[PDB]
Design a protein around this ligand. Structure first.
Ligand SMILES: C[C@H](CCC(=O)NCCC[N+](C)(C)C[C@H](O)CS(=O)(=O)O)[C@H]1CC[C@H]2[C@@H]3[C@H](O)C[C@@H]4C[C@H](O)CC[C@]4(C)[C@H]3C[C@H](O)[C@]12C
Ligand SMILES: C[C@H](CCC(=O)NCCC[N+](C)(C)C[C@H](O)CS(=O)(=O)O)[C@H]1CC[C@H]2[C@@H]3[C@H](O)C[C@@H]4C[C@H](O)CC[C@]4(C)[C@H]3C[C@H](O)[C@]12C
Ligand SMILES: C[C@H](CCC(=O)NCCC[N+](C)(C)C[C@H](O)CS(=O)(=O)O)[C@H]1CC[C@H]2[C@@H]3[C@H](O)C[C@@H]4C[C@H](O)CC[C@]4(C)[C@H]3C[C@H](O)[C@]12C
Ligand SMILES: C[C@H](CCC(=O)NCCC[N+](C)(C)C[C@H](O)CS(=O)(=O)O)[C@H]1CC[C@H]2[C@@H]3[C@H](O)C[C@@H]4C[C@H](O)CC[C@]4(C)[C@H]3C[C@H](O)[C@]12C
Ligand SMILES: [Mg+2]
Ligand SMILES: [Zn+2]
Lengths: 154, 72, 29, 49, 50, 1340, 148
């Protein structure tokens, strides 16, 4: 609708035309300029979506044509791009997995129930460091007031 | 313990109640009617001898069996 | 939730009153 | 040793021809099959408690 | 790598040895150690509650 | 006549019953399913052809353009099965298709094509069933299980009780077609039939019939009988049928003719009806109100004027009776309605009939089906017509039409797929008489209503929807009729079709992962019947009546083999002889009996017929002429079974084994075990890890040669021949000349499979049972697979076992194995588990696989070469690095006081982390193998290229040795061809062998075969050259890894699990255990000859678990080992050959009319030394599943060898040395080693990782999950006083972020305090409750 | 964090359905804003308002609304309230029944020799669960230097 109303400001019969053919231009770009905008959880440029839709379509007529499948090298010679500008886009797609996906076991464990943390301080490594500020406090205890203070200074 | 060690108990309870029902459904003792109640007509003494306690001739009992067969 | 436990093969009078009042798919609407 | 019951069907309908065998002797195929009704139902409902 | 068990406690657990698996937790807190020993230890719990 | 194999160790056999039919190819299900899917059906009803014809041809929207299917062909797979398992591809075949596009012109719709271009398209590819009925998807031989779904047909349900809760037993008949509407006739409590369309609004049942061009008279004619009243001038003299009015109360006194047959208020009997017919009461009169309670059958409307005096379905009184009597209609038609039998059900329907006419009925139906809107005449007419008669919107398959005409008791097996007003009236009649206590309801668990899908049909069905999905868009793109500008390649979009097929084969409740830890295990997972999956009932959808066993199961599905617990009966496994029908139904064979004779012409009968006949019993004797020796034979007719006569039986069973699954048939003495016991016994059968030196089953059933051959493990003889060279690597057999192929014979070579892992991380590997310079025949087995021994199935191993307590180590279900068992290596296994490692180049650059690593000692690596990969051979244990990987980290931003330390000793953290692969906890073994994949456009590694050289030489030397074997064969063929017809005497043998074919021969068939050999061998050379080049480039090339992958190096460990306390052990028939102690040899009981009993079971298992099989089998096995010990005494002493022959001969025959006959005529010696040396460990016995050895023959065996006939010895306690009382039983039970192996079970964690969203430990032993502290345990602790225990258990051990660190610190500091904090899960629940417009807070 | 967007090995990602539900509601809100500054026809804007009420209503919960508006997964998107209720939800499962550190599992066997007041333990499990205890003792003894 957003394109259909934007064209009402722009459509001109002053040439003598049908609005029907004129509208679908605006309304096509409406859906597609939006569909590449707000249709993933990770957003991507329309000129990159320009790329992915150019590969996936050019992937078709090569997979169907050559036989088995377009290797990214084979795409390098259809589309002469460096193939490490290509292969990065083929890493681009495949939006994230629903973390509420049900894993097997018939146990109802979702996928997210196994994704671990990386921010956590290893409970031993905290236990280590508590002796460090103690242990360096030990030698820094038996220092001179200048050296003991200057090192805490430094 | 092991599920066969329990499941035997389930099976024997089921079958014990089965035998109990199908053995209690025979009438034990009483004064025979000498006449099928649904027709008031004689129940011959062979049937009077086999199940001591019968109260129907073969026909009315057959009718009642067929009626109960549809459970209502 | 009369409660009735319906299947496929303050609510009793509440649901009775809401079942006594006679689609919202926004595409149908 | 003795005769082993009558081996009622799953619901509660008893099958009138018993298993006249025992386990020290064998059980021919129909004796075992008649056993299987009750064994199956019992195991199925002990896996449901 | 198995877990032993006094056989007179299986019945309390209702577990045979066809490959059944217990789990062992450690009472960390000293109040926890005392709770386990004075309230929960098997020798104090021989009579059924029901 | 015994083949060469079974001359080796000829299994002594019982089985008084004779044999009539041999066990067919057990995997016949999968094979003859998938031969129907990928194949050329000429008359297209199967495979891809069916689906292609289903959518093709395809025309435009009259757009002068059409599209037709011409013919397809399956390309060759790029990788073989082996390489495809290696790299991780689906072993599949591209599906080439020719499609001929056609487009017409103006004025030529019906005639001249404008142009037709055709183009061999690609249309996805499909996986191919391997030789063993298995598929291969992603390095994973997956198997597809036949599904068991209801078939389109007709069904009469009852649903006893539960409707109206008064005891009423409804009757709801349904007609499920393949494609169309779900017609459902259902009763009410009121006994008025009712009709629904697709679960839709109920209607008075005859509404459809009035819509079916029907009226009052002929309807009430078709559904009831005719009781004709008449005006016979005096008191309404009435005709009657004597048996039509049987048992009933004579509401009117039976009287006429000057007599009275019975009075009023009288019930009458059958002899009363014989008095009736004898006296032939053609007529009697009636009292005028006797007729008052009846329904008039026909129309009775005026003849003087033409007024309605009374029509059909309107009971008239004496008032209307006089209205008729005045009009002089000498007859009165009435229906027969009896509450006993002839129930009034159309009549009260007509009273509930809202209609009277046809077109109003149809407009009512349109009102229902098209609710809200208004109807009209032809609209509703056509809607009703197309709802059940329009082909596109209704059609029963031949399955549907067949079940229809069969359940209606009609004999027109084949007709249209759409029903008709006659075959609806028939459904009404059948449901009505089933309501009329007549006939029986067919419960759904019937195996005459559940068809068996298989992977062929399922995959064709999952492919045809892909065809329709693609054909839609092809139609849309051909509607825009464009110029001479396209192929059928822009039109044929591929990815949806292969996506659909990959959704099927990739993830379903079918296409299950294969249990490949056993011959039996995979050959039982191949013959599986599931009730689950797409199209069928899932878990809570149905239950207790799809799990239940049913008498149609006899022979068609095994009753006892079934998973115990979660899903029982839904995974009914197929039985031995049972097989698919043509219609998809199960048929099990039956010997066709004549008058009194058993003739070997077998017919496979489905469950929808077996009730129609009387089936004999295989356990029913007969004397050499088919005449049943007994005079009253046991037979099971439809349902039950009672003693029947010789000239009354229809068929006899195939064998006794017919009623058990191939998994269950391996139990010895299965007749002496409870059903649940044999159930668990078969499950423990199919959980048996292959051991190291697989022995043999001392008491089998004779199913074992079958279970060996029909699985994929053994490498059986492909042709009768002789073994030329045999090695642990390969076997080669120079085929004899008889079965030789006409031209360029050569030989057949079998490349065995060495130690390679199966999907349970267990070792699969051949081993050749042959010797060199040894014959073979066709069925003969060359290479043994895992868990076999010499062509039989040897899962577990037989132990000297005794039944006795022995000091509590077998208390509930424990076991006490002697150390002699674990020291004889008698239960070892090989677990070849695998470990991979990737290199995903992250944002900080790519990852490396170097050896110079952060903080790795010089000896701490010790096993990494320059590439950082372990050497093949180096024993690995906990923590050793298999592959040293390191991933960069950019400016960690290290801590102060660590900046201080690193400045003090000048050290500085590098750029790379320590993401280096390593061997997990505990698991210790050898590194038998390494693979090194690599991205194609990337540099390769030193070890990668080294493995490259190794691989290339491997393939080349493959071709070298195969060239040399084939050339030895072919040049010897040439030397033989030069033996007849111009025999080159010795000048042939002088020159080089390769200079032998161009030396020709005289112009005859010899010369033609010689030029044959020459030219074809030269072509062999050239084709081998190109083939080896393709091989090398297959190795030389790069790999296609998923995105973000650089190189991964899988490393295959090969662990060997030596037995220990904890590991699970169960006999063949369901007596499981968990071995408890590991006793030294001197403590085990030992018998009066001094040998130590090995396993000490618990003797209390046999009363409660009523499985007499273990006592009876251990007695029989004791006899078998006694015979073996006698032979060994005779043999090691080198007694004789004649006396040895005499003894073995007398051992091989005893027992009345035992079916086999082995004797030593064509022997021996040459054979009896071998037939002893293979029987020296103990004469292997057989016992059929239900025709086994009696107790008597067991005791005769026990008397042959000098063991005690009671089977029981005196044993001596090892420790005390003093002798037990009341002799104990021993004997050789065949025990197994289930893979509930403890040292992948034992597991515990101090402080591991923590799940991201909620700060709690993980779940899995792979991820170090902690034990769940569920809801019942919290109650258990509350029941005690444990509160600080509970507080720590659910605060500081699990959830709290700041208390767990403090807790760990206080532990290391010897202060056992605990700081509570807030459970992190509760903080998440705060944020979640508050995420709505709700303000929850924690007050002061 | 409670609705993270964790990175999965191999370039993929994993999110929770709360993420895309939030995204769709923000999209409908932006659209209605754009409509309001256009003063477009009230039919289109009223459909927008209806759609946003739909979006928020399926956000807070999935059951009262007619169709749980699923995603490219052929499963229903899992909204807010479903992360509190049910068996799987926080309350019934994760807030009482939760894993534990210092706990281990094994197979049980008999060993009838030992008295009722005790149980045997595998040595490996015993050295795992009491790891921090043994660290503390080895530091109390001076048999080691530091925890590392
Ligand atoms: C439940 C299902 C098994 C079938 C039963 C589970 C088990 C683990 C899941 C895969 C893994 O996450 C890895 C991978 C991540 C990608 O991002 C999306 C694809 C992959 C293949 C996942 C999809 C699916 O969800 C899988 C197969
Ligand atoms: C086998 C089962 C063992 C489980 C403990 C025993 C324990 C108690 C037995 C029931 C009671 O005796 C009462 C009653 C007696 C009737 O005669 C037959 C029915 C009843 C219900 C019995 C069935 C069965 O026999 C039971 C369940
Ligand atoms: C005995 C037989 C001659 C028959 C007269 C000759 C002819 C072909 C020979 C085999 C081939 O060379 C391939 C291979 C080469 C290895 O190096 C050694 C093993 C192999 C299997 C050989 C063994 C043996 O030497 C063979 C069977
Ligand atoms: C154990 C379980 C299967 C048992 C049935 C399998 C099925 C899918 C596996 C996870 C997924 O692949 C996603 C993720 C990929 C990472 O790279 C490695 C970790 C993750 C969490 C995997 C660990 C584990 O292996 C999972 C849970
Ligand atoms: Mg148990
Ligand atoms: Zn009577």
């Amino acid at each position: 609708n957003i394109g259909l109303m934007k064209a009402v400001d722009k459509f001109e019969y002053r040439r003598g035309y049908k609005f029907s053919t004129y509208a679908t231009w605006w309304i096509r770009q409406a859906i597609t300029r939006s569909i590449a905008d707000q249709a993933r959880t990770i957003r991507i440029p329309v000129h990159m979506i320009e790329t992915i839709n150019k590969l996936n379509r050019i992937s078709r007529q090569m997979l169907q044509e050559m036989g088995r499948e377009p290797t990214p090298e084979e795409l390098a010679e259809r589309m002469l791009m460096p193939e490490d500008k290509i292969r990065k886009v083929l890493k681009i797609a495949k939006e994230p997995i629903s973390m509420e996906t049900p894993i097997g076991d018939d146990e109802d464990s979702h996928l997210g129930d196994f994704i671990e943390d990386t921010t956590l301080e290893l409970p031993l490594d905290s236990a280590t460091t508590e002796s460090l500020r103690a242990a360096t406090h030990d030698v820094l205890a038996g220092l001179t007031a200048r050296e003991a203070k200057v090192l805490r200074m430094r | 313990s092991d599920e066969a060690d329990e499941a035997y108990s389930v099976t024997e309870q089921l079958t014990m109640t089965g035998i109990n029902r199908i053995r209690q459904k025979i009438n034990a003792h009483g004064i025979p009617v000498y006449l099928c109640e649904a027709c008031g007509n004689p129940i011959p003494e062979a049937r009077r001898k086999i199940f001591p306690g019968v109260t129907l001739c073969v026909e009315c009992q057959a009718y009642q069996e067929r009626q109960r067969k549809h459970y209502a | 939730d009369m409660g009735i436990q319906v299947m496929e093969e303050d609510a009793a009078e509440a649901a009775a009153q809401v079942l006594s009042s006679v689609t919202t798919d926004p595409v149908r609407m | 040793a003795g005769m082993r019951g009558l081996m009622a069907k799953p619901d509660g309908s008893i099958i009138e021809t018993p298993i006249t065998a025992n386990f020290r002797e064998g059980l021919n195929v129909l004796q075992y099959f008649i056993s299987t009704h009750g064994a199956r139902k019992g195991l199925a409902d002990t896996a449901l408690k | 790598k198995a877990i032993q068990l006094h056989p007179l406690v299986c019945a309390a657990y209702n577990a045979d040895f066809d490959g059944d698996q217990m789990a062992v937790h450690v009472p960390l807190t000293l109040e926890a150690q005392l709770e386990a020993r004075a309230l929960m230890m098997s020798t104090n719990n021989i009579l059924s509650p029901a | 006549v015994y083949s060469y194999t079974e001359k080796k160790r000829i299994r002594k056999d019982f089985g008084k019953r004779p044999q009539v039919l041999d066990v067919p190819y057990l995997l016949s299900i999968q094979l003859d399913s998938f031969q129907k899917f990928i194949e050329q059906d000429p008359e297209g009803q199967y495979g891809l052809e069916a689906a292609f014809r289903s959518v093709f041809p395809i025309q435009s929207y009259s757009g002068n353009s059409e599209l037709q299917y011409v013919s397809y062909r399956l390309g060759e797979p790029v990788f073989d099965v082996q390489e495809c398992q290696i790299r991780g591809v689906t072993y599949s075949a591209p599906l080439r298709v020719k499609l001929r596009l056609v487009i017409y012109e103006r004025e030529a719709p019906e005639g001249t094509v404008k142009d037709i271009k055709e183009q061999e398209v690609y249309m996805g590819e499909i996986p191919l069933m391997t030789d063993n009925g298995t598929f291969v998807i992603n390095g994973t031989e997956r198997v597809i299980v036949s599904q068991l779904h209801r078939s389109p047909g007709v069904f009469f349900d009852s649903d006893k009780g539960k409707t109206h809760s008064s005891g009423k037993v409804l009757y709801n008949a349904r007609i499920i077609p393949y494609r169309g509407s779900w017609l459902d006739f259902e009763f009410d409590p009121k006994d008025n039939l009712f009709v629904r369309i697709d679960r839709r609004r109920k209607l008075p049942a005859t509404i459809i019939l009035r819509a079916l061009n029907y009226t009052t008279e002929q309807i009430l004619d078709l559904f009831f009988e005719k009781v004709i009243f008449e005006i016979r001038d005096n008191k309404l003299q009435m005709e009657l049928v004597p048996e039509r009015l049987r048992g009933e109360t004579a509401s009117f006194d039976i009287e006429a003719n000057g007599k009275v047959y019975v009075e009023k208020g009288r019930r009458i009997t059958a002899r009363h009806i014989r008095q009736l017919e004898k006296d032939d009461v053609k007529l009697i009169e009636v009292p005028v109100e006797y007729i008052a309670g009846k329904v008039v059958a026909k129309d009775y409307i005026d003849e003087s004027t033409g007024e309605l005096i009374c029509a059909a379905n309107m009971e008239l009184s004496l008032d209307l009776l006089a209205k008729l009597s005045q009009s002089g209609h000498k007859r009165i038609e009435t229906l027969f309605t009896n509450d006993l039998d002839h129930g009034p059900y159309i009549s009260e329907t007509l009273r509930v009939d809202p209609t009277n006419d046809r077109l109003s009925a149809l407009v009512e139906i349109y009102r229902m089906m098209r609710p809200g809107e208004p109807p009209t005449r032809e609209a509703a007419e056509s809607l009703f017509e197309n709802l059940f008669f329009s082909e596109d919107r209704y059609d029963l398959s031949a399955v549907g039409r067949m079940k229809f005409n069969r359940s209606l008791l009609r004999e027109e097996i084949e007709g249209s797929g759409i029903l008709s007003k006659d075959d609806i009236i028939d459904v009404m009649k059948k449901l009505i008489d089933i309501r009329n206590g007549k006939g029986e309801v067919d419960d759904i668990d019937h195996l005459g209503n559940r068809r068996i899908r298989s992977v062929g049909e399922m995959a064709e069905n999952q492919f045809r929807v892909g065809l329709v999905r693609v054909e839609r868009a092809v139609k849309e793109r051909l509607s825009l009729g464009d110029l001479d500008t396209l192929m059928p390649q822009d039109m044929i979009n591929a990815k949806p079709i292969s996506a659909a097929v990959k959704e099927f084969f990739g993830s379903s409740q079918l296409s299950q992962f294969m249990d490949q830890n056993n011959p039996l295990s995979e050959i039982t997972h191949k013959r599986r019947i599931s009730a689950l999956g797409p199209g069928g009932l899932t878990r809570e959808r149905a239950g207790f009546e799809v799990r239940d066993v049913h008498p149609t199961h006899y022979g068609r599905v095994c009753p006892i083999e079934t998973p115990e617990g979660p899903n029982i009966g839904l995974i009914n496994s197929l039985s031995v002889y049972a097989q698919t029908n043509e219609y998809g139904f199960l048929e099990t064979p039956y010997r066709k009996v004549t008058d009194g004779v058993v003739t070997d012409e077998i017919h496979y009968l489905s469950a929808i017929e077996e009730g129609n006949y009387v089936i004999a019993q295989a356990n029913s004797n007969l004397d050499e002429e088919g005449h049943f020796v007994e005079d009253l034979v046991t037979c099971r007719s439809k349902g039950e079974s009672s003693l029947f006569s010789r000239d009354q039986v229809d068929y006899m069973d195939v064998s006794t084994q017919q009623v058990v699954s191939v998994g269950a048939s391996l139990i010895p003495f299965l007749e002496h075990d409870d059903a649940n016991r044999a159930l668990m016994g078969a499950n423990m059968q199919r959980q048996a890890v292959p051991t190291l030196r697989a022995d043999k089953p001392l008491v089998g059933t004779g199913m074992e040669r079958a279970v060996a051959v029909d699985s994929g493990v053994t490498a059986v003889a492909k042709r009768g021949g002789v073994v030329q060279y045999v090695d642990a690597s390969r076997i080669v057999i120079k085929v004899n000349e008889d079965e030789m192929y006409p031209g360029e014979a050569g030989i057949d070579i079998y490349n065995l499979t060495k130690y390679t892992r199966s999907n349970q991380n267990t070792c699969i590997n051949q081993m050749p049972c042959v010797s060199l310079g040894e014959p073979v025949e066709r069925g003969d087995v060359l290479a043994d697979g895992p868990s076999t021994d010499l062509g039989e199935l040897a899962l577990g191993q037989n132990m000297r076992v005794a039944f006795m307590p022995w000091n509590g180590y077998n208390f509930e279900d424990s076991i006490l194995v002697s150390e002699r068992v674990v020291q004889e290596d008698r239960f070892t296994t090989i677990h070849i588990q695998e470990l991979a490692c990737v290199s995903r180049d992250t944002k900080l650059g790519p990852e490396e696989i170097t050896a110079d690593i952060p903080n790795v000692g010089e000896a701490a690596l010790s096993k990494l070469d320059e590439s950082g990969i372990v050497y093949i051979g180096a024993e690995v244990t906990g923590g050793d690095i298999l592959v040293g990987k390191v991933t960069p980290k950019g400016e960690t931003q290290l801590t102060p006081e660590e900046k201080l330390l690193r400045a003090i000793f000048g050290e500085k953290a590098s750029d790379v982390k320590d993401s280096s692969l390593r061997v997990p906890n505990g698991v210790s073994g050898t590194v038998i193998d390494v693979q090194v994949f690599t991205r194609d456009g990337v540099e390769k590694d030193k070890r990668a290229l080294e493995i490259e050289e190794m691989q290339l030489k491997q393939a080349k030397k493959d071709l070298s040795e195969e060239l040399q074997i084939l050339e030895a064969g072919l040049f010897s063929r040439i030397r033989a061809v030069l033996v007849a017809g111009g025999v080159e005497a010795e000048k042939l043998d002088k020159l080089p062998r390769d200079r032998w074919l161009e030396l020709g021969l005289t112009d005859e068939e010899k010369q033609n075969q010689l030029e044959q050999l020459a030219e074809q061998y030269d072509e062999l050379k050239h084709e081998f050259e190109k083939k080896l080049e393709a091989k090398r480039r297959k190795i030389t090339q790069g790999d296609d890894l998923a995105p973000g992958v650089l190189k991964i190096v899988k490393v295959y460990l090969a662990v060997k699990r030596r037995i220990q306390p904890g590991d699970k052990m169960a006999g063949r028939h369901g007596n499981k255990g968990v071995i408890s102690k590991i006793n030294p040899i001197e403590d085990m009981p030992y018998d009066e000859n001094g040998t130590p009993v090995d396993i000490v079971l618990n003797p209390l298992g046999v009363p409660s678990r009523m499985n007499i099989g273990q006592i009876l089998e251990t007695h029989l096995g004791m006899a078998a080992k006694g015979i073996g010990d006698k032979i060994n005494a005779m043999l090691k002493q080198q007694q004789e050959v004649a006396k040895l022959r005499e003894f073995i001969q007398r051992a091989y025959d005893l027992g009345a009319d035992v079916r086999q006959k082995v004797d030593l005529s064509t022997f021996s010696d040459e054979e009896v030394m071998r037939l002893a040396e293979n029987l020296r460990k103990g004469m292997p016995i057989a016992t059929p599943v239900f025709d086994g050895a009696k107790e008597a023959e067991i005791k005769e065996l026990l008397k042959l060898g000098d063991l005690p006939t009671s089977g029981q010895i005196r044993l001596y306690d090892g420790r005390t040395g003093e002798q037990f009382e009341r002799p104990v039983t021993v004997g050789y039970m065949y025990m197994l080693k289930l893979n509930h192996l403890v040292d992948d079970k034992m597991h515990a964690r101090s402080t591991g990782s923590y799940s991201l969203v909620t700060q709690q430990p993980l779940g899995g032993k792979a991820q170090f999950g902690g034990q769940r502290f569920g809801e019942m345990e919290v109650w258990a602790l509350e029941a005690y006083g444990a509160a600080y225990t509970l507080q720590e258990m659910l605060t500081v051990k699990s959830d709290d972020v700041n208390g767990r660190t403090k807790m760990y610190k206080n532990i290391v500091d010897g202060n056992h305090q605990m700081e509570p904090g807030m459970p992190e899960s509760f903080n998440v629940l705060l944020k979640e409750i508050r995420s709505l417009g709700i303000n929850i807070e924690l007050e002061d | 964090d409670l609705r993270p967007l964790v990175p999965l090995d191999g370039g993929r990602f994993a999110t929770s359905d709360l993420n895309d539900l939030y995204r769709r509601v923000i999209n409908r809100n932006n659209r209605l804003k754009r409509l309001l500054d256009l003063a477009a026809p009230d039919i289109i804007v009223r459909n927008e308002k209806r759609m946003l009420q739909e979006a928020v209503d399926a956000l807070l919960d999935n059951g009262r609304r007619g169709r749980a508006i699923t995603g490219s997964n052929k499963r229903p998107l899992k909204s807010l309230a479903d992360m509190i209720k049910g068996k799987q939800g926080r309350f019934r499962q994760n807030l009482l029944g939760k894993r534990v550190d210092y706990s281990g599992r094994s197979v049980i066997t008999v060993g009838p020799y030992l008295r009722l007041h005790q149980c045997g333990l595998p040595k490996k499990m015993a050295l795992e669960l009491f790891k921090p205890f043994i660290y503390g003792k080895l530091e109390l003894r001076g048999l080691a230097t530091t925890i590392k």
